[PDB]
């Protein structure tokens, strides 16, 4: 029944100016995704391994949604830690 629920101990970040204003015409998520992809590598491997087990089955059953969801959730949580530093 509320638009939002207030929180305690939130860290409000400081804006990081760019070098060339034209640099921020691309989504600054691209700069943070590689580093966040390496820290969630424990799930990158569980997904690649589940694809092989499904590609080998004879019948047309099986999927990798479970491992895929966990992987990309890990990355989004890593990006949120710093994304607002580059947004006005």
């Amino acid at each position: 029944s509320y638009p939002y629920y207030c929180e305690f101990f939130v860290k409000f970040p400081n804006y990081i100016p760019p070098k060339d204003p034209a640099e921020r015409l691309v989504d600054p998520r691209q700069k943070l995704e590689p580093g966040c992809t390496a820290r969630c590598s424990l799930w990158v491997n569980e997904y690649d391994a589940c694809t092989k087990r499904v590609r080998a089955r004879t019948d047309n059953k099986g999927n990798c949604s479970g491992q895929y969801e966990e992987l990309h959730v890990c990355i989004d949580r890593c990006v949120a830690k710093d994304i607002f530093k580059y947004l006005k």
């Binding site: 694809t51 994304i83 947004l87």
Partner: protein, 243 residues
């Protein structure tokens, strides 16, 4: 089924007890709604007069309202007509009824966004994540036309196409546009639109909770004042011991 994942906590300014809305960002999010989202979504509870003195000045709101054609009547002959909009009019809706909306969106109904941040779990954090969660499908999942894969939407299969893409509108204040900037701005606008009385509510609460707390201290002292006369009392049986 399973429990959907909890969205991450983004540091929105309004989340603190002592903070207000960020009006410069609310302004930019209203441009995003008008030029992208309003093509499929209505906000039937909002009126142009709600923006005056809180987001935009009066003369600017008039110019925006007049750019629309609004139906009014009946006239002296019992007929309907159209005229430019005024401050008293509601935000224009793209479809007349729900059946017409589904017909134009493959059977799916785009919901009204007048209370959207109060109508979903986790509210603004969910909306921010949703808008940047479109991915290619995983191995073994094939979707039919009209459906798209999203990390945060329950079931993963959503009927809304990706609404945002880098470089598509030009803000008026010169802020460079990108998918992440537009997401943060449109969320701020929709949070304000869910309850424009949020700032009045929070500022009154600070004055009240602080006053009540001080009175609670005073009543504690007045209670202990009377507690001590019976906590330090002496009662002797038989004979008097000490004075």
């Amino acid at each position: 089924e399973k429990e959907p994942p909890h969205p991450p906590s983004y540091p929105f300014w309004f989340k603190s007890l002592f903070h207000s809305h960020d009006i410069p960002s609310v302004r930019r999010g209203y441009e995003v709604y008008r030029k992208v989202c309003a093509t499929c979504h209505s906000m039937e509870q909002l009126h142009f007069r709600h923006l005056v003195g809180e987001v935009l000045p009066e003369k600017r709101v008039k110019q925006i309202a007049a750019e629309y054609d609004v139906t009014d009547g009946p006239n002296d002959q019992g007929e309907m007509y159209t005229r430019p909009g005024i401050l008293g009019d509601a935000f224009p809706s793209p479809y007349p009824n729900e059946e017409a909306a589904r017909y134009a969106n493959g059977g799916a109904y785009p919901p009204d966004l007048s209370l959207i941040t109060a109508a979903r779990h986790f509210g603004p954090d969910y909306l921010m994540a949703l808008l940047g969660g479109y991915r290619d499908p995983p191995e073994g999942v094939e979707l039919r036309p009209g459906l798209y894969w999203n990390v945060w939407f329950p079931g993963n299969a959503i009927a809304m196409p990706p609404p945002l893409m880098d470089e598509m509108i030009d803000y008026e204040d010169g802020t460079p546009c990108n998918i992440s900037q537009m997401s943060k701005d449109v969320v701020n606008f929709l949070t304000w639109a869910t309850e424009p009385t949020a700032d009045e509510r929070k500022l009154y609460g600070l004055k009240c909770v602080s006053a009540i707390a001080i009175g609670t201290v005073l009543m504690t002292l007045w209670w202990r004042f009377y507690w001590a006369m019976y906590a330090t009392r002496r009662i002797d049986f038989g004979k008097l011991k000490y004075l």
